[PDB]
Structure formats: C-alpha cells, structure tokens
Amino acid sequence: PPSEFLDKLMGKVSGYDARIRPNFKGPPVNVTCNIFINSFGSIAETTMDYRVNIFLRQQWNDPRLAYSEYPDDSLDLDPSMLDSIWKPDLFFANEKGANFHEVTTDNKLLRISKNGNVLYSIRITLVLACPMDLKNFPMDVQTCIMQLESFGYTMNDLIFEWDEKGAVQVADGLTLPQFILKEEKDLRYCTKHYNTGKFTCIEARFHLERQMGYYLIQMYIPSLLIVILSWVSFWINMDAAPARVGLGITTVLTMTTQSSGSRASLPKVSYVKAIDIWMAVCLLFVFSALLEYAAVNFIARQHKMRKLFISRAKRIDTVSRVAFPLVFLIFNIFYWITYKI
Amino acid sequence: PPSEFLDKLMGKVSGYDARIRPNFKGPPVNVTCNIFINSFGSIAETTMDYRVNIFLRQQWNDPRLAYSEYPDDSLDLDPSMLDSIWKPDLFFANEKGANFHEVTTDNKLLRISKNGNVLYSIRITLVLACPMDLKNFPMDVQTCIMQLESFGYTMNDLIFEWDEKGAVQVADGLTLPQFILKEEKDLRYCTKHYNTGKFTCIEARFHLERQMGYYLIQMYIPSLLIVILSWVSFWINMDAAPARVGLGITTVLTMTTQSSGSRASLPKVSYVKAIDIWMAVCLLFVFSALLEYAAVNFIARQHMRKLFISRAKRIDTVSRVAFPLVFLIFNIFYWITYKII
Amino acid sequence: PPSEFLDKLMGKVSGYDARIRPNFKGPPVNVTCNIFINSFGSIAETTMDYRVNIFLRQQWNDPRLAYSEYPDDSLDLDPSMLDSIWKPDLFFANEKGANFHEVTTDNKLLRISKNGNVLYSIRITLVLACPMDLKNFPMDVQTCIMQLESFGYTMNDLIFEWDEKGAVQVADGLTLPQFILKEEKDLRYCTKHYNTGKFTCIEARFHLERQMGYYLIQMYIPSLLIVILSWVSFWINMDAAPARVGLGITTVLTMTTQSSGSRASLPKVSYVKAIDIWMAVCLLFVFSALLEYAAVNFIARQHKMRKLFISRAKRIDTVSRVAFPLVFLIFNIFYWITYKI
Amino acid sequence: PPSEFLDKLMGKVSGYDARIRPNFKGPPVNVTCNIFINSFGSIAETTMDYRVNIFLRQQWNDPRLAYSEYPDDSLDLDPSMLDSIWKPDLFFANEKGANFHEVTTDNKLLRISKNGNVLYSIRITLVLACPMDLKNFPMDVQTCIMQLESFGYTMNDLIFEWDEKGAVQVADGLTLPQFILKEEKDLRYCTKHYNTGKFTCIEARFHLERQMGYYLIQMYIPSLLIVILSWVSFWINMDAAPARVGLGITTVLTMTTQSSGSRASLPKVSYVKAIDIWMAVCLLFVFSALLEYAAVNFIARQHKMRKLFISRAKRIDTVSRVAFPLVFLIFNIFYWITYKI
Amino acid sequence: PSQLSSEDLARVPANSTSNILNKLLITYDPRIRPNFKGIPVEDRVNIFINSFGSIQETTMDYRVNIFLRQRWNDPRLRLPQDFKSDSLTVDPKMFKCLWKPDLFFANEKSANFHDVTQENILLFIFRNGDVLISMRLSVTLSCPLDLTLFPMDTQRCKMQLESFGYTTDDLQFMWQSGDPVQMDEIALPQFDIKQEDIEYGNCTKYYAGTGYYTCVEVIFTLRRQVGFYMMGVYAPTLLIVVLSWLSFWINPDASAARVPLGILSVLSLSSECTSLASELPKVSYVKAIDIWLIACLLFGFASLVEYAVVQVMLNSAAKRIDLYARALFPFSFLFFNVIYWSVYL
Numbered sequence A, C, D: 001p002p003s004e005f006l007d008k009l010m011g012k013v014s015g016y017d018a019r020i021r022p023n024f025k026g027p028p029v030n031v032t033c034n035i036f037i038n039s040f041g042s043i044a045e046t047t048m049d050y051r052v053n054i055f056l057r058q059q060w061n062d063p064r065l066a067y068s069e070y071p072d073d074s075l076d077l078d079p080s081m082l083d084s085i086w087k088p089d090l091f092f093a094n095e096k097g098a099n100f101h102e103v104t105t106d107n108k109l110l111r112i113s114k115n116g117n118v119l120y121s122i123r124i125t126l127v128l129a130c131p132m133d134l135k136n137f138p139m140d141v142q143t144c145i146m147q148l149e150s151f152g153y154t155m156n157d158l159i160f161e162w163d164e165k166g167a168v169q170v171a172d173g174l175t176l177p178q179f180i181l182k183e184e185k186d187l188r189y190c191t192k193h194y195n196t197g198k199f200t201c202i203e204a205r206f207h208l209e210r211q212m213g214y215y216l217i218q219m220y221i222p223s224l225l226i227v228i229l230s231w232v233s234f235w236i237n238m239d240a241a242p243a244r245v246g247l248g249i250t251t252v253l254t255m256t257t258q259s260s261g262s263r264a265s266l267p268k269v270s271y272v273k274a275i276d277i278w279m280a281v282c283l284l285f286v287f288s289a290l291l292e293y294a295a296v297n298f299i300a301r302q303h304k305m306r307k308l309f310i311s312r313a314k315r316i317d318t319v320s321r322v323a324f325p326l327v328f329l330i331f332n333i334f335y336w337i338t339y340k341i
Numbered sequence B: 001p002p003s004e005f006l007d008k009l010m011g012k013v014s015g016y017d018a019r020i021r022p023n024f025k026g027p028p029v030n031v032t033c034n035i036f037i038n039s040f041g042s043i044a045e046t047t048m049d050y051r052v053n054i055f056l057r058q059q060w061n062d063p064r065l066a067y068s069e070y071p072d073d074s075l076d077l078d079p080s081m082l083d084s085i086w087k088p089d090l091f092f093a094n095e096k097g098a099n100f101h102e103v104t105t106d107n108k109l110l111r112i113s114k115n116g117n118v119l120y121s122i123r124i125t126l127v128l129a130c131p132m133d134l135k136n137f138p139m140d141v142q143t144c145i146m147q148l149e150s151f152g153y154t155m156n157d158l159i160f161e162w163d164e165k166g167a168v169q170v171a172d173g174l175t176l177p178q179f180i181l182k183e184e185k186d187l188r189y190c191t192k193h194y195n196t197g198k199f200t201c202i203e204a205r206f207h208l209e210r211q212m213g214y215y216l217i218q219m220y221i222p223s224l225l226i227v228i229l230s231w232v233s234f235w236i237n238m239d240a241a242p243a244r245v246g247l248g249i250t251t252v253l254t255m256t257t258q259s260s261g262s263r264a265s266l267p268k269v270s271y272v273k274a275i276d277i278w279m280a281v282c283l284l285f286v287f288s289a290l291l292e293y294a295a296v297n298f299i300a301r302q303h304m305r306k307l308f309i310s311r312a313k314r315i316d317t318v319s320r321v322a323f324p325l326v327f328l329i330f331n332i333f334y335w336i337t338y339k340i341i
Numbered sequence E: 001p002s003q004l005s006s007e008d009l010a011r012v013p014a015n016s017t018s019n020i021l022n023k024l025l026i027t028y029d030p031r032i033r034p035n036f037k038g039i040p041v042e043d044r045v046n047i048f049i050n051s052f053g054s055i056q057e058t059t060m061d062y063r064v065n066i067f068l069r070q071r072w073n074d075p076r077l078r079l080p081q082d083f084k085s086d087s088l089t090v091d092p093k094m095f096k097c098l099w100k101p102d103l104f105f106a107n108e109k110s111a112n113f114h115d116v117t118q119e120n121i122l123l124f125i126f127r128n129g130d131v132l133i134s135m136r137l138s139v140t141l142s143c144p145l146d147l148t149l150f151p152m153d154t155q156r157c158k159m160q161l162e163s164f165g166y167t168t169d170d171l172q173f174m175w176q177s178g179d180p181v182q183m184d185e186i187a188l189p190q191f192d193i194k195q196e197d198i199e200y201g202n203c204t205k206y207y208a209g210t211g212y213y214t215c216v217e218v219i220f221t222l223r224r225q226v227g228f229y230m231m232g233v234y235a236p237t238l239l240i241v242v243l244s245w246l247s248f249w250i251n252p253d254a255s256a257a258r259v260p261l262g263i264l265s266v267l268s269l270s271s272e273c274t275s276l277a278s279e280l281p282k283v284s285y286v287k288a289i290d291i292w293l294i295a296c297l298l299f300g301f302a303s304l305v306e307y308a309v310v311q312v313m314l315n316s317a318a319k320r321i322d323l324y325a326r327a328l329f330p331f332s333f334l335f336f337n338v339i340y341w342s343v344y345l
C-alpha cells in the first residue's frame, strides 16, 4: 500500500517537519532546474511584456525521506497533499502575473526516489517584463530576460544551478508575427546583493530579430519612387507653369498621405526612430524641388538684345537635374551603412 | 437508497483506494474518448490562438467497482465527491487557458454500470495555440490541432484511443466570419517520446479556408481599374502637357491612398504576403506611365523637325500595346503560381 | 525545533489575542515603511490610472513576542499561520485594484526578533489612479502619487512613518514609451481629518516629463514646411491663374490631410490642447494666402487708368512678400515662450 | 477582554440567531445610508456603463446586542466572524459587476455601541449601467443612476432611508477626459412595486455635461473655412475654365477627407447625431458651388443678337455673390438656435 | 461540514428557523429527486431581463443580465400544523442539503453569480411542499450573425435552458402560464429590440441512445437602424456620381479641365471607400454595402474612359457621343437604383 507507506514517513509518528529545510544547520542544498518552453509570443511594446508557457522541473535531495524496505523504486505523491513536503521557494524576478493549470486535474507531479532524491514538475504560464529600445526600429535586436531567484533564503541555505545538459529547451514549430527567436541562448549567473544578505539567481537570455522584409516593400520603396517623380520636373519646359506647379505639388501631398495613415502600423513611441528619419528627409527633397521652380520662374520673368537672363534660367535647371540625384545618393549610402553595419 | 450503497462500494470498510489505477501491476488501461463541439471562433492572428467550447467524454473499466445484487444497472455519483474515484490525468498539450462551468451546478457527470464501466462527461472551454503562416494571405489554408495526452503515465499504464464511431462531432448551424471549416477531419496518433518513456497522445485536425469575396471586390478590382486609367494618357495628344501630367500624378496619388488605407483591415505581420506583391507591381505600372511621357516630351522640341516628331510619335504608338501586354503576362503568372499551388 | 517553540508563544496557554493591538491602552503603535519598485508603466489617459509592482515592508514592535531561551536570534513564520499575528490594517487610498502573488508559494515573509521586533515583507501588484491635465499636451509635467492609509485606527492608536534612509527605491533599467521618470521624489505627510477622528497617512510623489522628440519631427516640422510652400504663390506671376489657384487649394488639402491623419495618434479629450492651437492657426495662414490672390485677380480684371489697377495689384503682391513671414515669425515668438516659460 | 465578552452576547450560550431580523413581528427596521465616492470615470458609449469606487455605510439598531456592563463601549468585530451577525441584504439594481477589496487586509469594519446601534462600513467597486442618448452628441447632458435595493424584504420588515446630512460626498480633484461632473446631486425615492409586494429603493442622480472645446476648433471651424473657399470661384474670371473647375472639385475632395477622417473619433452610433446634420448640409453647399458653374458655362458658350447670352451669364455670378453667403447665415441661425437655447 | 443527521445539542433553536428544518431534514437524501421511480417532476420557469447589449460580430456573442425563477413540488417537505408561518427561508450557505434541478444554458460561453453585499439567492418552502428559488445571473450567450445584407439586416438571438443529466422521463421544463419573459426600458447603440419576443416551443433534444432531454427556448428579434448609413455613407457617394456626369456639358476642347474633373472624382470615391474600411465590421465576404460602393466606382471610372473616346475621334463633328452620353449615364444609373432597392427593401 503506497498510501499507507507515505503516511509513515510523513505522519505525526515521524519527526518530519515541513517548515525545516534539509540539512539543517549544515551545508546548503543544491537545486537543479530545467525549462521547457511550449508557447512564446504576444510581445507588446505598449506594456513591454510577453507571455510564456513553460514546464518547470526542480531536483534536490532530502535525507529524511529515505526508505529501503519498499519494493517499488519510486513513490508518487498526491497533489492535494503537496503542502506537507518542504519545497524551494522559487519565484520569478521580472514576473508580472502567473497562473497554475487545472484543466482536468492538477498539473503537478512530485516523485520521491529510493535514495531521497525529489523530482518536482509543474506547468505554469507567465507574463514577464522586458524593456525594449526602439531607436533603430526596423533594424532592432531585442533581448528577453528570464530570472529564477529565491524569496528569503541566502547563500548559506539555498543555491540554484542550471542543468548540465539540455537546460533550456524550446518546442519546434514556433512562429512569431514580428520576430525570429534564435536557437542560441545564454545561461548566466545573477546574484543579488542587499543589506540583509546575498541571494541566489539564475538567468536565461533570448535574442530576437525583426523580419524587415515588409517595411522595404511597403514604405521604403514607395517613398523612394515618389522622390523620382519629384525630379521629373527638371526635364519639362518652364513655360508650362501649371504643368510644373501641379507636379511639384501633389507630390508633397502624396508624401504626406504616405507618412500619414502609417501611424496605426507604427508603434506608439514618443522618441525618434530609424523610420522617422527616412520619412522626414524624403519630405525635404520633394519640398526643396518646388522652391527650385520658384527660383527659375522668378528669374526668367525678371528679364521682361542680350537676352542672357533666359540662359541663366537654363543654368539653374541643368545643374539641378544632376546635383539632386547626386546629393540623394550621398545621403542614401550614409543612411544605410550607419544603421545596418 | 443508492446513496448509502456507495459506502459499501468504497470507503473505510472497503479496500478501494483512489491513488491506484485499475488493473495494478498488469495490462494498461484502455480509455475511449469522444468530443462534441458547441462553439468555434475567435481566430486571432496576433496571439496565434483560437477558442472552442467542447464536451469531453471518457470511458474505461474498473473491476473494483463491480456489483451484482443492486437491481438497476445505472448508478450516478454526486459531483461533490468526485475526488474519491480514480480518474485519468488527461490534459491538452497546446493549451493556453481553460476553465470549467458552474452556471447553476457543476457541469460534470459520473455513471457506473454493473460490470464496472465508468462514464465521465464534462464541459470545458479551451484557448488552444494554433501557429499559422500568411506567406500567401488571401489564398491560404490553415490547419488547427487539438491534442489530448496524459501527464504522468507511460505505455505500461495508460493508453488513449479514439472512439470507433462518432469520434468528433460539430453542432449544427455553426459559423465564423473569416474562415470556412471543412467537414473532413483527421484523427491521428502522435505519441510523445521523452527521456523518461513514451506518453500517449491523440490529436484531431481541422482544415480552414478563407473566403475571397471581400478581397476580390475591395482590394483587387479597384486596383485593376486605376492601372487601366493610367493607360488613357497614351491616347491624349502629346501637346496637352497640363492634361497628361495631371492625369499621371493623380493616379499615383490614388494608388497610394488605396494601399495606405487598406492596411487597417489587413493582419499585422512583418514578412511579405501575396497581397503586398500585387500592390507593389500595380504601383510600379503607374509609376512608369508618367515617366514615359517625359521621354515623349524631352524627345519632342529637342532642337528635319518632322523626324524628331515621328520619333516621339512612335513612343506612344509602341507603348499603346506594350503596356497592356506586359500587364497581362504578369497577371497570368500571378494567378498560376498562387491559385494553383 | 523552531516550530515547536512558536506553538508555545501562539498557544492558548500563552493567552495571545490577535485582535488586540500591541501596547493596549497606552502609547500609539509606530510603524516604519519601505517601498521597492520593480516595474512601472501602463500609463493611460483613457482611465486616468497606471500600474506598478512593488515590494512593501513594515516594521513595528510587540512586547508580547519577547523570548530569551531560544538560541536563534530570528524565528520564521509560515505564511499559512499569518492569522495568528496582529498586523496593521494598511491600505492604499487611490487604488482601483490589487492582488497578491502566488507563482509557486505565497510571496510573504514574516520574521520575529528576540526583542519583539517584527518584520513583514510582501509583494503586491497595484493599479493606482491619478488625474491628468493635458492642456499643454506636447510638453507637460505630470505628477502621480501613492497614499498609505489606516482603515480603522486613529492617531492615538496607529501612526505611519517613512524610513529615514532608502524610503523609496526604483530598480535600474526601467523605461517608458512616453514619459521619463525623474530621479527626485517627494515624501510628505497627508494625514486625513474626518468627523470620526484623525487618521494617519504617508505619501510619495513621482514627476514625469514627456519627451517631445517625435512630435517635433512629425507634426511641427511638416506643418512648418507646408506653410512656407503657400508663400511661393506670391512670387508666381499674377497672370498664371491655373498655377496660383491650383497651388493654393492643394496646400489646404495637404494641411487638412496632415491634421486628420494625426487625429488618431492623440489622446481623446474634449478641451483644447496646445497642439490644437498650432494646427488651427497654421490652417488659417494657408487659408488667408488663397484669399490674397482673390483680391489680386479681382482688382486686375477691372477695366480690361489702365496701369493704375496693375500698379495696385502689383503693390498688393509686393507687400505680401514681407507681411506674411513677419506675422508668422511674431506668432512663433509668442507660442514658444508661453508654453516654455 | 473584549473577545470573551463579545462571545457571551453572540455565542451558543446566548439565544442570538443570525437568521432573524431585529424586532421580529414588530415595526420594520430603519437603515441609514451614506455614500462617499473615491474615483469616477471609465464612461463608455459602446457598452453604456460607468465605473465607480465608493465607500458604503449603513446604520441600524439591534436591541438584542445591548449591553450595560462593559466599562468600555464601541466593540469592534473581526471580519472573519462577520457572518455571525445579522446584516441587511442590499444590492445595486444597475450593477453589472462588483467585487470587494483584499489589498492588505479585509476592507470591512463593524462596530457595536452600548445602546445597540450597529455601524457597518465597506469599500467596493461597481460597474453600473446607464442608458444614453447621443441625439445631440457634441452639446448634450447625461444623467447617471445609482440605485440601492433590498433583495428579499418588504416594507413590513425593512426600510431604507438616506442620511439627514452629507448623504452623497465626492472627493475633490476628480477629472474626466470628456465630461464635467455637476456639483448638484438629486436624492429621490423610487420604490418598486411587484406582485409579491413593495420593496425599498433609494437612488442618487449625477448630471454630466460634455465640453465643447475640442469639437469647435477641430471639426466646426475648419468646415466653416472650407465653404468660404468655395465662394472664391464667384470672383474668378468666367472664361478661366481650368481654374474654376479645379477650385471646387478639390474643395469637395477636401471636405470628404475631413468628414471621413474625423468619423473615426466619433462613437459608433447607428442613428443621426447633431454634427451629422452639420457635415451633410455643409457638404451640400460645396456641391452646389460647383454645379452652378456649369449653368454659367453652358449658358455663355451657347451660340458662341448674341449679347444676351453673355449678359445672362454675368447675372448668375452677380446674384450668387450675395445669395450664397446669405442662405448660409440663415442655416447657422437655425442650427445654433434649435440645438442650443 | 454538515450532515442531515448529526450529533449536536443546541437549546437555542426554539420555534426559530433553525429548529424546524432539522426535523424536516431527517432521512432526506438530496441526491434523490422528488417522486422517485414515479411521476416526473415539472418546473415552471420565468425570466426577468435587466440588461441587454454588448452585441459583438467579431466573436458572435452578447451579454444579458437576468433574474431566473424556478418552481416545483417536493412531497418530502410537507409543512405540518406545528409551525404557524406559511413560508420558510433557507439560509444561503447551506443549499447542499436540498435537491435542485440541474439547469444550464446550451449556448452559454461564460456566466457568474452576484455577491455584491450578500449572495443574491433565496429559497422559499410553502405549506404544500412547493419550492421557489430565485437568483441573479450574468450570462454570455452565443448569437450567430449573418451580415450579408449588412446595412438593413434582421438578427434572431437565441436563449436555451436544458437539463444536464436528467431525461424527459424524469425532469420536464415548462414556461409560466403568464408573463414568462419580461422587459425593461433600455436602449441599444446600433440595434433596436422589439416587444414581440416569441416564446418558441420546447426544442427537446434527442441524442444517440441516451434518450430525450428537455429544453425551452425564447427568441429575440433585432433590427438595425439605417439613419446613419443612409446619410453618412449613401448620400455622399450619390453626389460624387452626379459630379462625374458634370463633364458632359463642358466643351471638348477643354482638355485641361475635363481631365482633372474626371480623375478627382475617382480619387474622392477611392478615398471615401477606403476610409470606411476601418469603421465597418470585418466579415471577409461581400455585403450589401460593398456592392453599392463598387458599382458607384464603375460609374466614375466609365466617365473618364468615354472622354478618351471622344478626344481621339476629333483628331482623326464627332460630338454626338457627348449628346448621347448626356441622356445615357443618368438613364442607366436609374435602373441600378431600382434593381438595388426592391431586393433588399
């Protein structure tokens, strides 16, 4: 009878106390941890958080729970009586909300081996917080942080350690709307220092990269095409005043309605981004071309024999249709090499 | 008095224990499962999940509950004492939140026959994870997975089996806006392999298809009409500079507002979809419609004068048929590689 | 056994009463409080509230919990027996909702020293309300408070006091998408007066500044360039009626697109903000430029004395080339001094 | 000790029963109610409800709790044993959801005086429902209802009364994004009659007024400037067909851009509102400005004594210079006098 | 921790509420229905509706706050002549010792009780064993909406009440003779409820071999007001089409005048349609509003196309096209309106 055997090791006949850690007044207890990510995503920049579903496994030793007469190698414990076994008080430092799972039964499992080793596996969901920097918004690399650290136990009592092999595992076939979760992860020690003492921690880091493919075909390329329509006015005779005025205008309007309407897609950020610099400079080129026609229209009418003022109007257009693509190419090769490389 | 009969079945005097599976140290337990679906919807692209309301029914055999003296076969059990009966530890693998129902009483039912068969029916809501890809967003077919698996039992103790007939049923008159749920469903075995053993699991697949009614009449047909409107310029006399320039630049502005205004109803992703390629090429066609007129305008009055006029007239004659033929070639290649995959 | 020693102190033979405050019928109970902030954000003007996740610590004294026989200096208390110890009835005055954290265990700790000193640390997630003024929305300073009341004890029973060092601490690396949290904080007493009596409270204040780097490059600079484009028409010839009218009416269309496109990215209020005054009068300048040409064209059309109307029409365009920039420069002086000084 | 003294009055020795109302088979008990409002807001038209945070106080006399032997008065009850005393059954008939508060302790308090008076104060949050009428959406007044109702007691057993002074109090410093809370409250009796009998009810009414600042400067003034720009065409030269056609087809395009762009900020209401009349009529004025030009264009062009055609063409423009602004002033007089004053 | 028959001595219940039911609850099994192995029990159900709204087309559901009352007869709860008062009140913390029917809603997604100050549940027991239970709920039923004729559509929402584990042979549900469903004075944002709620007959469920199960059904009918769409969406689109016909009266030589008029009418209709994509519901199929918007775009598109026809015929009279199109474009547009209406009504 496994239920009868556990009552002997745990009942009032035994001297087991659930509020006393193993190896009392002695060496600290080792705890080995494992993480298995099932779900990942829901990354939002408004609240700077992301939701993760994991399997958490803890292993330690307890010399008080040692048996030799029972034939079975391992004994399972009823989840409704889990409060009568000492357990480490693990919790997440950047945790902003968490739940247990009771879909049909309790999703908890505790198993006691013959030599006193205890295995403890639970399935929980978390809402962890990560700070995000969107300065280089399309070409951004973010880092997500997972911390597992104690509540009221110092170095002298409880020490956390990652597993030797297969510490962090992720299920295959996980996709994100915006990011790529890289297969390389970092396992680093953290150790908080306070006035009360020194506390244990372990850290796991993930790296994320954006697709960047959609922003090229949707807002970079159409912005590049519009400023080409700005330069076509230099190949039209200036006697057709409504032609060049009506083309210089409605190109700024096209650029304005390209910047506007993207406000819903772009995240709500109160500082400048990489995309904002591109849209402002592209508006500056289509604006500066309309002033070029005002310089050549006013000079031509100033003349009204030598007739050299008309040739002066030619020199404004001849220079401008070569200098405008050259100064745009200089900015373009300056923009990409300092925001990508 | 059926209530007092349960104490003779299980209790202090009886040897029945809720922590021991039936047929201990013997053959594994056969479990037969059925699923009835009441609701289906809330297909969320951002969080990669969907919601469902189901009825779950499990059947197995317990030899310890056999009786022969009580006259009638059926013997219901009160839901307040459901923890005194051994039950399988079923749980959903891709589960992101679930709950029971207590609208007036507990929505559970347990029935015990004379031979020992146990019937267990519950009603739960699920929020299941369904990864999806929108590489070809308007023409896509998506598969939804619903997995049922054990938590702490291997092949040697617990085996899950689908019902022979009526395994998965859907309530009549069910609808959902975006997709169409096909009647064909697949029932497969996906046994999990771990470092501790093999764990039983069964899955059901649903096939979803999107409707093309709204996208063809809102985003494809109006985009086709604007491109045809840009070909009007090849028939206007080449001396009408304000008419041809004004028509060309307004079609570019009309295309930009069509693309920028339609992003509100599209899903938010970061990779290129099939609808983005259609909008990018359509913008490229009206971009080149105005640019050829600059070649027409610059070739004319460049300086025997009828030789240059005939050179400019042949550009409009050639482009009168080259532009519709090129667009037809792209249009054939677009639908062949997408609608027939 | 530390647990056995605490049973004697909490036993009915000891006569300890949880409802009786320490130092009954004597001097009031003086409590020291500390606050450590883990996360900050979710600032919303729709519901006038923000979220926070803090560590709260309270220290007081109790002469009944004095021991000298036990060698250990401090004795820990399990979270399940927290109802056997008197605790202050602290609560937050301006909170809308709160909850504790139970991710793996209870996130509560209580310690009892030898001289009766009691420490009590918990982890709380809070939603706190704060009124906001958006009359200066592009550049404004907001203040958010935090109050700690006593529910049912007056000044002669319970007094709350801040810690003299390290009262409020904020974890490093916190960021917000809109505001910037300043380093300095204010600690003050805001004790309440009621008809029933006088009740203790303590307060902490945070000052936030909204960085306006995005609003300058997206809303102010593009609005400035559109107004400058309207002054180009004063240099175009007055005979070019389709050129000047087409430029004038399209500039108003561009300005209206800029205003309506930015409407969805601003907080939903009903009073006039500082951004609304700038957008209204920039529309007034481009509207007045179109009426300027109407006076020029109407005067010159009379009697088509012949050079009298042409001189009068030319004199209007001559003075409008310098009147419009100086009026706009005067207004920009008054706008950027009122909202900055 | 007050703990053992209270148990004499309410324990198994005494004949006190919590299921019997005070003054059984006698006059009904009278309850005096007070309400203190902490926070107010979250007013939404899509769900037609609002959220409050209130303090609720009730006073009644229980002769079975009178004591005349304790040296002290005003005994306080622990919230754990709060179900051992009789309390009136109160609920809000407008409630769509409510909860208590457990921020650090239980936010409840009960006090028993010497003569038998009972004081009971709790802190709760409510989601109350109020119908709304947006027929005059920019300038309108709304009334919100807070009802207090007895569940299962008639006038023969329970009677609810408002407090004599300070019945409803609102904390200073409350702000709302779109509404102004009037300082004049109304207290009324709204006793409900049913087939079972009469039931007590007391209500408090709040008046809300919507500010006109944002809508007047963003959607009313720019609409007025646009229709003035449509009247510029009456002063342009008659033969300038491209100038007068463009000024009037862009003005319609400008007007529909503002009307559709501002519609996103509007509440989702399927019937007509006050500004919907304004936007439709002001659109009709721009539509009529372009239509009259064709009457001018067709009359003058006809038949290339032919001087009557030119004379009749100028007569339309001369009349329309004064008829169009005059009829718009009549509309403004009627609109502002029937939706206000 | 309570029992129907437990050993406890308390002298304080003396002809009180607590004194009388303990004599009634002796050898009373709460798991046994009244009239066991005999006549099935019958329930009288009536519903009072407090709040109605939050109708959503994204998830196809709506939230209702109700008062639910059931009545039946229990011969095991006879009230003798010993107790003078007719009715008894059961304390709400102890319903576990009484038999109640297992009612639930078939199309329910989420529901909860109300405990704002006390539990909002009461139970009465009469002299002849009649039991009355009243309670307050907040359910979230599911309503499948069909938005094919979106501007003018009629939706029928459904409410069902079944028994979870009792067949028709044991438990039957009945509507009250008079006033089964009652209404209040509330308003809705978009729809408009009607005071003609048909109490549909009992839709008894038949399952594969388990047996019949009782259910009762009430149907609500909703109608959508067309005031906003007819003036905000329909009337502006009608005016732009008239401006597309405006160029027929302009001289054909005005190439710089008719071209911008014909291309800015297309831009106005294109901007108007795409601005409403963020306001109308998303159903991803063709609605009745979308047919109007695409057919209006064809009329604006065809106005510019015919000008290219008349512009090329002159440089190759040929003004008969403009004379013919003057009485053709309004004449063909009139038939579309007669076709579009009198189909959707």
Ligand SMILES: O=C1C[C@@H]2OCC=C3CN4CC[C@]56c7ccccc7N1[C@H]5[C@H]2[C@H]3C[C@H]46
Binding pocket: A150, A151, A152, A153, A194, A196, A199, C036, C055, C057, C109, C121
């Ligand atoms: O006295 C303290 C305050 C301090 O608060 C910041 C957060 C901390 C994380 N955990 C939570 C409980 C705490 C602790 C344990 C045992 C005695 C005192 C005590 N704390 C907090 C402390 C740190 C360290 C530790």
Ligand SMILES: O=C1C[C@@H]2OCC=C3CN4CC[C@]56c7ccccc7N1[C@H]5[C@H]2[C@H]3C[C@H]46
Binding pocket: A036, A055, A057, A109, A111, A121, B151, B152, B194, B196, B199
């Ligand atoms: O040791 C483990 C870790 C591993 O974690 C991934 C998830 C799993 C699903 N269930 C949950 C509990 C688990 C299990 C049962 C009995 C002993 C060890 C044990 N686990 C997890 C395991 C798999 C398999 C099984």
Ligand SMILES: O=C1C[C@@H]2OCC=C3CN4CC[C@]56c7ccccc7N1[C@H]5[C@H]2[C@H]3C[C@H]46
Binding pocket: C150, C151, C152, C153, C194, C196, C199, D036, D055, D057, D109, D111, D121
């Ligand atoms: O009699 C009262 C009413 C008054 O309500 C406003 C809020 C208050 C904050 N706390 C909550 C309980 C209260 C209090 C304590 C002891 C006796 C009476 C009593 N109250 C409220 C009171 C204030 C002060 C205090």
Ligand SMILES: O=C1C[C@@H]2OCC=C3CN4CC[C@]56c7ccccc7N1[C@H]5[C@H]2[C@H]3C[C@H]46
Binding pocket: D150, D151, D152, D194, D196, D199, E048, E067, E069, E122, E134
């Ligand atoms: O029989 C009824 C139905 C009716 O339902 C509408 C709501 C009401 C508010 N409370 C809730 C319980 C009720 C009541 C009390 C005692 C016996 C019958 C009874 N009710 C409801 C009744 C009203 C009045 C009262």
Ligand SMILES: O=C1C[C@@H]2OCC=C3CN4CC[C@]56c7ccccc7N1[C@H]5[C@H]2[C@H]3C[C@H]46
Binding pocket: B036, B055, B057, B109, B111, B121, E163, E164, E165, E166, E207, E210, E213
């Ligand atoms: O065996 C079953 C399966 C079937 O599932 C579809 C839903 C149903 C609604 N209720 C829920 C429980 C059920 C029932 C009652 C008693 C024995 C078996 C049993 N069920 C379900 C059944 C129907 C009918 C009934």
Ligand SMILES: *[C@@H]1O[C@H](CO)[C@@H](O)[C@H](O)[C@H]1NC(C)=O
Binding pocket: A027, A028, A029, A030, A159
């Ligand atoms: C693990 O346990 C051993 C002995 O119990 C001791 O070194 C210490 O407590 C732990 N070691 C580490 C490195 O944590």
Ligand SMILES: *[C@@H]1O[C@H](CO)[C@@H](O)[C@H](O)[C@H]1NC(C)=O
Binding pocket: B023, B027, B028, B029, B030, B159
């Ligand atoms: C359960 O099913 C397996 C697979 O057929 C079978 O081998 C086994 O015998 C079954 N269990 C029992 C108890 O018969």
Ligand SMILES: *[C@@H]1O[C@H](CO)[C@@H](O)[C@H](O)[C@H]1NC(C)=O
Binding pocket: C023, C027, C028, C029, C030, C061
């Ligand atoms: C603060 O409270 C302590 C606890 O009783 C008391 O001894 C001390 O005198 C108080 N200090 C004051 C009132 O300044």
Ligand SMILES: *[C@@H]1O[C@H](CO)[C@@H](O)[C@H](O)[C@H]1NC(C)=O
Binding pocket: D023, D027, D028, D029, D030, D159
């Ligand atoms: C309650 O108030 C009424 C109103 O006059 C009074 O008649 C009645 O006696 C009061 N109740 C008690 C118990 O005094």
Ligand SMILES: *[C@@H]1O[C@H](CO)[C@@H](O)[C@H](O)[C@H]1NC(C)=O
Binding pocket: E014, E015, E082, E083
């Ligand atoms: C209670 O009622 C009974 C009759 O039902 C009566 O005989 C008795 O006197 C009453 N009082 C007490 C205290 O029992």
Ligand SMILES: *[C@@H]1O[C@H](CO)[C@@H](O)[C@H](O)[C@H]1NC(C)=O
Binding pocket: E174, E201, E202, E204
């Ligand atoms: C319920 O339905 C049954 C048949 O399914 C019918 O006999 C009975 O009369 C119905 N009850 C009503 C309509 O009240």
